[PDB]
Amino acid sequence: LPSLLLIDEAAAVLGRMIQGLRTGIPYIHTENDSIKANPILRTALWQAAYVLEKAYRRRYRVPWTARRYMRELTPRQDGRNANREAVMAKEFPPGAELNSDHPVQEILPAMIIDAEDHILFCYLPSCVSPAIMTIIDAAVGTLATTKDGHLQKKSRAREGERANWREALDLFRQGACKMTPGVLTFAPAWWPVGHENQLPGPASTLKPPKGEGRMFLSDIPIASALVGAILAQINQPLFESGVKVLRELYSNSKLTKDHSTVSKIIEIWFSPFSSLSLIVNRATPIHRDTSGPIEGMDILVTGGNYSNGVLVTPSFNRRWTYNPGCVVALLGKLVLHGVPEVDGERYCMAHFWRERLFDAAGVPFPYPSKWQESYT
DNA sequence: CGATCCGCTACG
DNA sequence: CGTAGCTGATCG
Ligand SMILES: O=C(O)CNC(=O)C(=O)O
Ligand SMILES: [Mn+2]
Question: Which residue numbers delimit the 2OGFeDO JBP1/TET oxygenase domain (predicted)?
Fold first, then answer.
């Protein structure tokens, strides 16, 4: 699977770039590999290297462990129960480093670690190169302007109507938009709701070989490769495990339904993640994501033509500047996060996990990494 | 109990 | 695309 070898090389080269920034010995990339063959990607790796190098120098600590926090949470605790969330806010407060009457919105790259150094949240503003943002802009635009596509049809079909908060009508930007608002999710293999005691199969959005879902995957391999390499700098065990899981699902036809389609999708899946969701022109209320493993680190990428983006993390007493090209890695099942409506058009690519694909592939799901792992 | 959960299936 | 069916665990 050359796609996975490509993202492995991107991850390894990004690690060498970062190491070289930290030691003062500039890394000299010499191999005739996929990074030499994709200079746009190489340059974007350099830009990410500089942002990650800054984030590692700016670590706030909370006075509790992720372990205790996750023990207190119930399996589907997403933030909608105010009494429970008051219990969490009192039991697990921001601490002295973060509490502050009226703190300023953050702009420098940074991270939040727990009392035993596990990374909970990694903030990478201006991480994605303009060239790759243009590529993503075009891929999302193609998806969100398709005349009879999911977003347009789902728009019109429920514009006759003018619980499931992720597609709630009032969260979508109203009026004329270049990009029809909506949500589409993609996965090489996953389970139907309430149906996990069976083999996973391809997401319905990706099953047509020439439908728009597969075409969207085809437009973004350079971006997915960048995102995967960033993940590898933050939690290398999780990156390597995700890649191993995809290789196993590719190799063993007994693990999925419709394995031939799963294999053709994996061949264009340039990512370590289990799943990718595209959220177009939608505000995001404060929430936790409950369907993945709490040990899983999700990655958010935000884009578009807007200028006042803010990502809110109330448990950290922080607001973060969240403008196009910003990347946020976070334990989304622990960390409450939200993104208010913005004055312009926006999309988000959210990368996340399905733990039982790890079980099915015989690959342990690793516990969240510590910051010192960056310096080994 | 009913409602909910980043959903698939066969049909129209 | 939508609709109804289907699953099992959580949550109120
Ligand atoms: O909208 C954003 O930028 C962030 N999105 C999410 O956290 C989500 O949809 O789960
Ligand atoms: Mn989320």
Answer: 224-355
* Distance between Cα A333 and ligand 2 center (Å): 8
Instruction: Report which of A3, A16, A4, A24 is spatially closest to residue A45, judged by C-alpha positions.
Output: A16
Q: Which of A337, A349, A353 to mutate to test the pocket of ligand 1 (most atoms within 8 A of CB)?
A: A337
Q: What are the residues whose beta carbons fall under 8 Å from the beta carbon of A375, sequence distance 6 or more?
A: A22
State the angle between helix axes of A236-251 and A221-234 in degrees (0 to 180), rounded to the nearest 10: 130
Q: Is A252 helix (H, G, I), strand (E, B) or coil?
A: coil
What technique was this entry resolved by?
X-ray
| CA–CA separation, A347 and A301 (whole Å) | 8
For residues A69 and A334, the answer to whether their CB atoms sit within 8 Å is yes
Give CB contacts under 8 A, 24+ apart, made by A68-75. A68/A92, A69/A114, A69/A334, A70/A294, A70/A333, A70/A334, A73/A288, A73/A294, A73/A333, A73/A334, A75/A290
Among A253, A223, A232, A184, which Cα is nearest to A325's? Answer: A223
Give the Cα separation of A151 and A181 in Å (integer).
7
Burial of A180 (0-12, 13-18, 19+ CB in 10 A): buried
> From CA A315, how far away is CA A89, in angstroms rounded?
7
Residue A45: which of A121, A128, A108 has the closest Cα?
A128
Contact (CB, 8 A) for A278 and A52: no
Q: Which residue has the tokens 């005349």?
A: A147
Distances in Å between the Cα of A4 and the Cα atoms of A7, A51, A224, A246 are: 5, 24, 11, 9
Measured CA A203 to C1' C5 distance, in angstroms: 19
Contact between A123 and A111 under an 8 Å Cβ cutoff? The reply is yes
Tell me the two tokens of residue A80. 């909608």
Q: How many Cβ atoms are within 10 Å of A175's Cβ, its own excluded?
A: 4
Helix (H) or strand (E) holding A156: helix A150-157
- Strand C atom within 7 Å of A80 CB: yes
